[PDB]
A paper describes a structure:
To target disease-causing proteins that are inaccessible to small-molecule or antibody therapies, we are exploring the use of a nature-inspired drug modality that exploits the intrinsically favorable properties of synthetically constrained α-helical polypeptides (Helicons). Here, we report a rapid, high-throughput screening platform utilizing phage display that enables an unbiased mapping of the α-helical interactome of a given protein without any prior knowledge of its structure or known binding partners. Analysis of 14 high-resolution crystal structures of Helicon–protein complexes across six different protein domains reveals a range of binding modes, all of which are “side-on”, i.e., mediated exclusively by Helicon side-chains rather than involving main chain amide interactions. Biochemical and structural experiments demonstrate diverse functional impacts by the Helicons which bind these sites, including inhibition of protein–protein interactions, inhibition of enzymatic activity, induced conformational rearrangement, and induced dimerization.
To assess the ability of Helicons to bind and modulate the function of enzymes, we screened the cyclin-dependent kinase CDK2, involved in the regulation of the cell cycle, and also the peptidyl-prolyl cis-trans isomerase [name] ([name]), which binds non-α-helical peptide substrates and catalyzes the cis-trans isomerization of proline residues. Peptidyl-prolyl cis-trans isomerases (PPIases) are a family of enzymes that recognize a diverse range of proline-containing polypeptide substrates, and are targets of the “trimerizer” natural products CsA and Sanglifehrin A that bind [name] to form ternary complexes with the proteins Calcineurin and IMPDH2, respectively. A Helicon screen for [name] binders afforded a pair of shifted clusters that competed with CsA both in the phage screen and in in vitro biochemical assays. Cocrystal structures of Helicons from both Clusters C53 and C54 confirmed that they bound the site ordinarily occupied by peptide substrates or natural products, providing a second instance where the screening platform was able to identify an α-helical binding solution to a site ordinarily recognized by peptides in a non-α-helical conformation. A PPIase assay showed that these Helicons inhibit [name] activity, as expected given their orthosteric binding mode, demonstrating the ability of Helicons to directly block enzymatic function.
Residue numbers in the entry:
A (entry chain A): 0 to 165
B (entry chain E): 1 to 11
Write the structure that this text describes.
Amino acid sequence: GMVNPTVFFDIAVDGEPLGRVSFELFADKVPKTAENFRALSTGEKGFGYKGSCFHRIIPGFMCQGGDFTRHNGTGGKSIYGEKFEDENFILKHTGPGILSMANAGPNTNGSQFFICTAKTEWLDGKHVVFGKVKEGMNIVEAMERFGSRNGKTSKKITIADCGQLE
Amino acid sequence: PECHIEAYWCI
Ligand SMILES: *CC(=O)Nc1ccc(NC(=O)C*)cc1
Ligand SMILES: [N]
């Protein structure tokens, strides 16, 4: 009876399997943003997250990824073009596991995203929350240990596989 | 700019 999609990332450390993280996507609250992430996880539009890396990881903050075009952390594109408007700001950054959109100002949402590892209320109203870690948060915690204070990672944290579970 | 990094930096 209408159920929020569930997608997974199989995380790899320099090609070594680390573990699976699954996300609920709040299609009920933000349909356009949830669908962007869902389809980039399946690649069903011809492009998506598979093979991309988490290029900025700041312990105590978040794990950022989603640039599958240039891979340097400046690229990425949505399924609607290269950017789409801020759908809404209903859902908040309530704690670890929150899935939020990175941007460069209002209405500049692309494909880059971050997984919060803490409460980040000072992001409310500027970045669109669209999902939340369902399971595998212990895997996200391990990814955090490869980060640094400026986000540089000490190994290649890549999305070795991704897709949809539900 | 990366607004969430700049927010983290200001905080
Ligand atoms: C893109 C954007 O919104 N950047 C930004 C700059 C400065 C601050 N300052 C504080 O939070 C105190 C927030 C966001
Ligand atoms: N800060």
